[PDB]
Amino acid sequence: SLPLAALNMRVRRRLSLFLNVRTQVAADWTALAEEMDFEYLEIRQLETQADPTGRLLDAWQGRPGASVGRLLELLTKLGRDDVLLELGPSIEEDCQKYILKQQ
Amino acid sequence: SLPLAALNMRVRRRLSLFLNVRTQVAADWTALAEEMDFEYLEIRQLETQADPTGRLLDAWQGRPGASVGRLLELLTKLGRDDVLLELGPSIEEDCQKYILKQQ
Amino acid sequence: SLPLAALNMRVRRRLSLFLNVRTQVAADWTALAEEMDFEYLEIRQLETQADPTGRLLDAWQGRPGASVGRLLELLTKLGRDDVLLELGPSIEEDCQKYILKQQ
Amino acid sequence: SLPLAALNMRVRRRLSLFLNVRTQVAADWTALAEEMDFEYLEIRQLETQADPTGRLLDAWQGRPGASVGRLLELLTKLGRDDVLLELGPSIEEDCQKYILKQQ
Amino acid sequence: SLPLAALNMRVRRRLSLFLNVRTQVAADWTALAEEMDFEYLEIRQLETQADPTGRLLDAWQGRPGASVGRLLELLTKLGRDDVLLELGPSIEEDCQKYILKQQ
Amino acid sequence: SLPLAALNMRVRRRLSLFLNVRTQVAADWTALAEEMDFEYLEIRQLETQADPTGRLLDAWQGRPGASVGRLLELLTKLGRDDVLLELGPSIEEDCQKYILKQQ
Amino acid sequence: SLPLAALNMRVRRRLSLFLNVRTQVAADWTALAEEMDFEYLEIRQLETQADPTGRLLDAWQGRPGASVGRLLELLTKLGRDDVLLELGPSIEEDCQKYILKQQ
Amino acid sequence: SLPLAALNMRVRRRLSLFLNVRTQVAADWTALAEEMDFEYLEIRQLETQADPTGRLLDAWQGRPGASVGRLLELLTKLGRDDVLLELGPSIEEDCQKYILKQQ
Amino acid sequence: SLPLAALNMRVRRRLSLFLNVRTQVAADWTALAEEMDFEYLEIRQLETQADPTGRLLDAWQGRPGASVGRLLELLTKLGRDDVLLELGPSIEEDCQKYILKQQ
Amino acid sequence: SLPLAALNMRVRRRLSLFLNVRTQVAADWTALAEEMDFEYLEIRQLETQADPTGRLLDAWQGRPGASVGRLLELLTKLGRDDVLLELGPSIEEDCQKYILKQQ
Amino acid sequence: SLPLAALNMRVRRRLSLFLNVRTQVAADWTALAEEMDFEYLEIRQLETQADPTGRLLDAWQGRPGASVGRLLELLTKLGRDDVLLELGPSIEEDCQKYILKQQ
Amino acid sequence: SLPLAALNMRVRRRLSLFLNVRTQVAADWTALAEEMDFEYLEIRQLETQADPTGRLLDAWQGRPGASVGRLLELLTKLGRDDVLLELGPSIEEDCQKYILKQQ
Amino acid sequence: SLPLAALNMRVRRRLSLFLNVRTQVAADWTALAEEMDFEYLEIRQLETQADPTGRLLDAWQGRPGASVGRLLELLTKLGRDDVLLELGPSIEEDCQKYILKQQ
């Protein structure tokens, strides 16, 4: 559907709080980065700078498959329903704000 | 119900004091880790780093069945009523604080 | 009320010292930029150049809702009462100077 | 087809919002600048001044292969379909305005 | 009283030496971060970057209850009188310097 | 053949689960680190940081003999056929993905 | 067949209760350790640390002949049918769980 | 008097050599940990990690009664005059060094 | 031979992906920076800013020994044949493009 | 004595190499910035931009106490005799050049 | 020899591409500006406007030591042989054109 | 004599391999840190970040007694002649390189 | 001669298998630890952690008399010719590998 420029700073910080908690067992932002067809060296470069989830979403702005619904189904494919229950209405509320800005 | 981000540092330390006392006979954090569908190698990786209960709860943040009530009923399924009598009101008090933060 | 041209260089530097301290947790200038209906790409463009709070106030000069009182109530909506206690009398003192310049 | 003077300020700002978000992994304006046969020192000179995408399009005004359709196919060669879905109708609407100005 | 901008780099380093010694038993900076109404994911994000006490004080700059006396009474509520006996006169000496800078 | 940048995060975590189970009798990651011509002090430095198998593979990125097939035959020389039966098809599936990324 | 990572913590504790009862006459874990081609000094090193059956199974993770069926036939070769009658269905139930995790 | 930050690494290792020799009869570091008002689960958590005397002194850094003279009188209350005869002049020599660092 | 202005953005990013993976054991970009006669404080200054390999190549633009072949033989002297097998044809392809631009 | 315009680019880079190595323990440029009566928010603003020592000396150009000898005695008050032994003759050589330019 | 009016726009742009790449480590145009006896405030004024190398050469038009050979030996004194190998024949070709214009 | 900026990355890594092997009995980097008049909380802060020997040498850059010969005699005072026999000629070879850079 | 960093993981495990078999009559690792001038409390601290021979060799890395030949003659002074007949060629083979690494 619509690109990830609809997601403003408040949602993109709340995704960061969940996803850059770096765990060796479960699906942190590196599992998401692998599901978005990033090379290992790209993920390893994103590990260095702070907020790697935000830089991951910035690097996944211009990619041939990127959208908001693709992000919401990749977060379901990872099984992390932690984020879709809290960022459920906020992502829709920032979708409708971007649509109203496009009028 | 609500995710394990409602559980702040004070409760998550008091669960750690009970659960990472590693016993060969009774139900320590490894029995809880088995009840949360972790592989043996995941539990064996969590044994290495300090506070394995806290890293266990961090790795069980994003999992398809995780919640606070699921944790409270898995601690009942293990029979450890040691923790539910002391962390009874504290888990509710940090549930209501997270709800009030969501307003 | 009156536009943000009443705010001269001394107040606009003291807002910059508080607001462009970039934090991942609390409300820096990006939370304020989101509260003023800026797109994510606008905020991301303002991050690049130095003094992003000053360029944020320059980009919020000509906007349909902009005023001094709107700024003072958006800084209350973010909860940052750090700035309203120190820039309390200075914003009024530069309001009254702009009024006296209009005579 | 027709040169890049057909692209007025509104499209050239919306390309700037997408393309000068400088990422180390994906295709920002420097990948586009490399696809338009610029030397490394030219791109390095364009990095210094603000809005490097606008100065990139100004430096690619007079070049032997430059057109609007060449820009639209170089943005497809980079795979960034982020911009062609939002700047789809606007580039055509400013093409038809330039044609009507030529009568 | 007065905000935490009165606390310069020397005091803010000496608080860091005491408070980011991370202990599982006593009150390190995470107990202080919980006493300042931070979510678990905020504290978990502050654990990642170096000097978490300094980033904790930066994130507690703009918060509705923040002051120097609030910090001095939260360090008493944690019972850590280690810091109030050594940073006793230094916090007052940097309070009086900030007051003299305000004249 | 092809370098270890073909091995993305999912395989490199599954090698970590088998290989950093530290045993005194059998061949854990330290036997593999010795087979890759590392000094004792290098292995002793890799023991300190978490995920020593991942940091071992990162330190064996740029080495004169490193490849994917060299890793698969060093894991056979150690006799650990535990990993080649489960990471059999996954290493080939991430080889073919890296080849398709090179086109 | 499938490796010993299928055996989670509950089965690996119930094997430990039977097998590390150290007897001079019958077949405890040292007879099993001899049947798995361990040297005397390896078994003597495993005697020192607590739960020697669990460390024995960890040291027999990566070995050229190790599997679950090999363990079940070595426990038959020792004649200990004490364990195969109680850990009969549990080893199959944790085999099928590992297969379902591999999907 | 003065806090336990006066005690540097050499004294804190020599206390560790005496006190973490774990005896069932006499007063090792657990008797000292009980005399410093630690809960049983705190002491049981300190038993797990290596150098429990050093982690005990780190956890007794910020506590309402902690000082160097309190430590020297709690080691007298336990009757262990083994440590006060060898760490007699060294604790004073590191007290006077901390005082000279405070000037 | 020819200077490092022949190396455009695509090669200079692919060198960055390999070389700024910062390892304590092997030869990352700091070993290369030492082989190019940089002082420790220069390398320590280059560590601070992002993409230190790109800023390293920019600081090694104007140096008395710098060329493309010198870079290719210093990457052989470090033994990193990881980069010469993938950036083999690309460095020649951007050499021949710079020569054709010089005509 | 004479102002800091006597210090040209070569000395001001060599002070930068020593002083902006950011350490948590010793006296980097932030201790010097505190000794020159800068507020915490000023130092925090200078941390953001690259070469903070050079921007620190630029912000300490016009200040009521600034001179070259004041800088040389503040670098002695911090105890950093690292810089006065190497930038000993160079600061005098650029003092005498500024005097000869004033004739 | 002959003044810098012999250097036309094409050479003066190619010197600009090399020299105004602003590096903190090597010799950019500010090292050249220091070698031509400019004050720090002059160089700091030249930093503000775009193409600082061209404005540097314009400000070094009328100076008592300025010539083309002085520029070619100051670029050798800085060790930047990057520019003398590419702007070797072009500076001579624009010297001979200026001589032929003087006839 | 000469400061620790003479010691480049290769020597400073080889000191790190010997000195940050953390032992409870012998003289690791913490004994060296105590011999260089660091407080316990400084050493405890240096323990947290990786390569504590390198950060120890960075924090001992600007200190009133620091030099290369002081380091070589403090490593003799600790009795560690392990490092002076292997880093014997390398420290002199990087001393003479720094002297030749000073010319 | 050469230090104990020449002894890699395979020899250091084979010494551990012989030497940490703890006997009350013969010469285990504690007799060797006494022959290397360790205090009783040091040996008693090394008894606690697993592989006490490896931690004994790590604590005897930096000691004024430590070498490989000193170890081989202290194992002869204890009369244990069990280890010199099996670790005869392996210690020489890892000596020659360390020499070839020093080239």
Numbering used by the authors:
A (entry chain F), B (entry chain J), C (entry chain C), D (entry chain B), E (entry chain G), F (entry chain I), ...: 19 to 121
Show sentences the authors wrote.
Iterative helical real-space refinement as implemented in RELION (He and Scheres, 2017, Scheres, 2012) was used to calculate a 3.1-Å cryo-EM map—as judged by the Fourier shell correlation (FSC) = 0.143 criterion —of the hMyD88DD filament with refined helical parameters of 5.98 Å and 98.01°. The hMyD88DD filament can be described as a single-stranded left-handed helix of death domains and is similar to the ternary death-domain complex (Lin et al., 2010). However, unlike the arrangement in the hMyD88-IRAK4-IRAK2 death-domain complex, each hMyD88DD subunit—with the exception of those at the end of the filaments—resides in an equivalent environment. The inter-subunit interfaces are composed of type I(a/b), type II(a/b), and type III(a/b) interactions (Park et al., 2007, Weber and Vincenz, 2001). Type I and type II interactions occur between successive layers while the type III interaction occurs within each layer. Therefore, hMyD88DD filament formation likely proceeds via an initial “seed” consisting of a type I or type II homodimer, which then associates into a tetramer and continues to grow. The RMSD between MyD88DD from the ternary complex and that from filament is 0.76 Å, confirming the similarity in architecture of both structures. Interestingly, although the hMyD88DD construct used has a 30-residue segment belonging to the intermediate domain (ID), which links the death and TIR domains, this region is absent from the reconstructed maps, suggesting that it lacks ordered secondary structure. However, our finding that hMyD88DD spontaneously forms helical filaments whose architecture is identical to that observed in the heterotrimeric hMyD88-IRAK4-IRAK2 death-domain complex (Lin et al., 2010) suggests that the helical arrangement adopted by hMyD88 during signaling is an intrinsic property of its death domain and is therefore independent of its interaction with either receptor or adaptor TIRs.
The human genome encodes ten TLRs and all, with the exception of TLR3 (Akira et al., 2006), require the cytosolic adaptor human Myeloid differentiation primary response 88 (hMyD88). Receptor ectodomain dimerization facilitates association of its cytosolic TIR domains, providing a scaffold for the recruitment of other TIR-containing adaptor proteins, in particular, hMyD88 and MAL/TIRAP (Akira et al., 2006, Gay et al., 2014). hMyD88 also encodes an N-terminal death domain, which is joined to the TIR by a linker region, the intermediate domain. In vitro, hMyD88 death domains (hMyD88DD) assemble with the homologous domain on the interleukin-1 receptor-associated kinases (IRAKs) to produce an oligomeric structure, the Myddosome, which has an unusual stoichiometry of 6–8 hMyD88 subunits and precisely four each of IRAK4 and IRAK2 (Lin et al., 2010, Motshwene et al., 2009). Here, we show that the death domains of human MyD88 spontaneously and reversibly associate to form helical filaments in vitro.
